[PDB]
């Protein structure tokens, strides 16, 4: 309980890295504030990541975005710039149906028209694993991909295996708790919060 949200939020041992998995840019703004003034290096996954990509000027295709907080993302990148690690490779499909994925082989950053982003690709998996390897604290909150689809849940299981195979790891999200329960990801995480608004307030 307090050993993670309160005790472990005071004097973390460097290096410290945090993972935020969500599909809304405007659903975790405050979290960023307390996180950026607490944790330096942060992984970001989900639809809010595509909002960030739209803010940066990269193409987005037919992916869901939040056009209200584009300037908020530009501001959070302008002040602090060497903090976030957004994925590079994006598995794409024509529509919302979980069909066999399609990749952009050249210029993996760009998402072409007629495709939406749901899960990160193998290159993003490898770079995230490399970032995870050199770490001392893990704070997982939410799925970076789309767990509800069969053909879009490889990223979450791969990152869970990376976090569990190798320093203290924990879980700080209700969606992360659900992913752990549905996949068995409590090997390294001490406990999960499942606080929802309570977790956001404790992280704000």
């Amino acid at each position: 309980e307090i050993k993670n949200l309160d005790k472990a939020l005071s004097r973390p041992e460097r290096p410290i890295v945090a993972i935020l998995g969500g599909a809304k840019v405007s659903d975790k703004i405050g979290v960023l504030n307390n996180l950026l003034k607490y944790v330096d290096k942060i992984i970001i996954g989900g639809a809010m990541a595509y909002t960030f990509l739209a803010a940066q000027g990269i193409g987005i295709g037919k992916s869901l975005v939040e056009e209200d907080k584009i300037d908020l993302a530009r501001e959070y990148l302008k002040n602090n710039l060497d903090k976030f690690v957004l994925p590079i490779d994006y598995a794409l499909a024509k529509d919302f149906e979980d069909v066999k994925p399609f990749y952009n082989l050249e210029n993996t950053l760009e998402i072409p028209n007629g495709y939406m982003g749901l899960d990160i690709g193998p290159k993003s998996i490898e770079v995230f694993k490399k970032y995870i390897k050199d770490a001392k604290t893990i704070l997982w909150n939410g799925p970076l991909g789309v767990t509800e689809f069969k053909y879009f849940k490889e990223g979450t299981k791969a990152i869970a295996k990376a976090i569990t195979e190798l320093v203290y790891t924990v879980v700080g999200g209700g969606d992360s708790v659900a992913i752990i329960e549905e996949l068995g990801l409590d090997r390294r995480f001490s406990h999960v919060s499942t606080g929802g608004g309570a977790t956001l307030e404790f992280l704000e």
């Binding site: 940066q56 690690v85 590079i88 490779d89 050249e106 993996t108 950053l109 760009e110 028209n113 290159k123």
Partner: peptide, 27 residues
């Protein structure tokens, strides 16, 4: 052809400063 032509996309320096090491390496 569009997939290939996505390579030859011009990025402004203002945008380019906002990328990360991972995105820059991918590019």
């Amino acid at each position: 052809e569009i997939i290939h032509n996505l390579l030859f996309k011009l990025y402004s320096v203002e945008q380019l400063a906002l990328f990360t090491i991972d995105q820059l390496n991918a590019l």
